[PDB]
Amino acid sequence: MISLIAALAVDRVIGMENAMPWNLPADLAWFKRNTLDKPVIMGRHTWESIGRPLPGRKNIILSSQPGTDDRVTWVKSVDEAIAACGDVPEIMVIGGGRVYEQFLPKAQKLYLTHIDAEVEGDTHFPDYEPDDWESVFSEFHDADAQNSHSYCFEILERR
Ligand SMILES: NC(=O)c1ccc[n+]([C@@H]2O[C@H](COP(=O)([O-])OP(=O)(O)OC[C@H]3O[C@@H](n4cnc5c(N)ncnc54)[C@H](OP(=O)(O)O)[C@@H]3O)[C@@H](O)[C@H]2O)c1
Ligand SMILES: Nc1nc(=O)c2nc(CNc3ccc(C(=O)N[C@@H](CCC(=O)O)C(=O)O)cc3)cnc2[nH]1
């Protein structure tokens, strides 16, 4: 099955000028936890934003153009991206905006972090129909010395 994982600020903002402006180490730890040892699918802009392969994961990059780095797998379509994952229980789609839009209709699970921060951004998580999704896990955390905003981890399953 296909899952999406994302961190959303207020108004579903996920990025600004090809970057993620906040720093929330608790949330990056959650991301690592939930993606380690799974294939991760990302768009080319997100690959450039991360800037290097994610270790311990098969990194699959969607681009219409040929690949420029053989440390990762390059594919030209959604169907090719899925096929390159092989027969695994869970495929993690890690964005960005355009890639999330394409995989949302196929996804069975959403791993969402809601961050209490207002960021003037240019990229948004897709508008999802809330009736289609059941919350199966929710955990709220106040800000602390390491994490300057409060945040909520949620896992939603398609009903
Ligand atoms: N907060 C979060 O959870 C989170 C997560 C991920 C990313 N982000 C942010 O999101 C932003 C990047 O998002 P974005 O929407 O601009 O870009 P994106 O979705 O990362 O990448 C878009 C690119 O991927 C390729 N692509 C997408 N679908 C394709 C298809 N079906 N076939 C072939 N190629 C395809 C194209 O590359 P070519 O142009 O090479 O064809 C396209 O230009 C950044 O600000 C990043 O920091 C935030
Ligand atoms: N919940 C969530 N938070 C995010 O920040 C996030 N970011 C992306 C895309 N961008 C990034 C940027 C950096 C790293 C990163 O450096 N991760 C290391 C963290 C090591 C750690 O903090 O433990 C990794 O190994 O996963 C991952 C994804 C996709 N989904 C997300 N999902």
Swiss-Prot record:
Its EC number is 1.5.1.3. CDD domains: DHFR. Disulfide bonds: none annotated. SUPFAM superfamilies: Dihydrofolate reductase-like. NADP(+) binds at residues 7, 13-19, 45-46, 63-64, 76, 95-102. Changing residue 92 to F: No effect. Increases catalytic rate about 7-fold. Changing residue 28 to R: In strain: B[RT500] isozyme 2. Changing residue 152 to S: Increases catalytic rate 1.5-fold. Increases catalytic rate about 7-fold. It comes from the Bacteria. GO terms for biological process: 10-formyltetrahydrofolate biosynthetic process; dihydrofolate metabolic process; folic acid biosynthetic process; folic acid metabolic process; one-carbon metabolic process; response to antibiotic; response to methotrexate; response to xenobiotic stimulus. Substrate binds at residues 5, 27, 52, 57, 113. Residues 1-158 form the DHFR domain. Changing residue 30 to G: In strain: 1810. Pathway: Cofactor biosynthesis; tetrahydrofolate biosynthesis; 5,6,7,8-tetrahydrofolate from 7,8-dihydrofolate: step 1/1. Changing residue 42 to V: Increases catalytic rate almost 2-fold. It catalyses: (6S)-5,6,7,8-tetrahydrofolate + NADP(+) = 7,8-dihydrofolate + NADPH + H(+). Keywords: Antibiotic resistance, Methotrexate resistance, NADP, One-carbon metabolism, Oxidoreductase, Trimethoprim resistance. It holds the Pfam family DHFR_1. One of its GO terms (molecular function) is methotrexate binding. Belongs to the dihydrofolate reductase family. PANTHER family: DIHYDROFOLATE REDUCTASE. The strain K12 sequence is shown. Key enzyme in folate metabolism. Catalyzes an essential reaction for de novo glycine and purine synthesis, and for DNA precursor synthesis. NCBIfam families: PRK10769.1 (NF008037). This is Dihydrofolate reductase. It comes from Escherichia coli (strain K12).
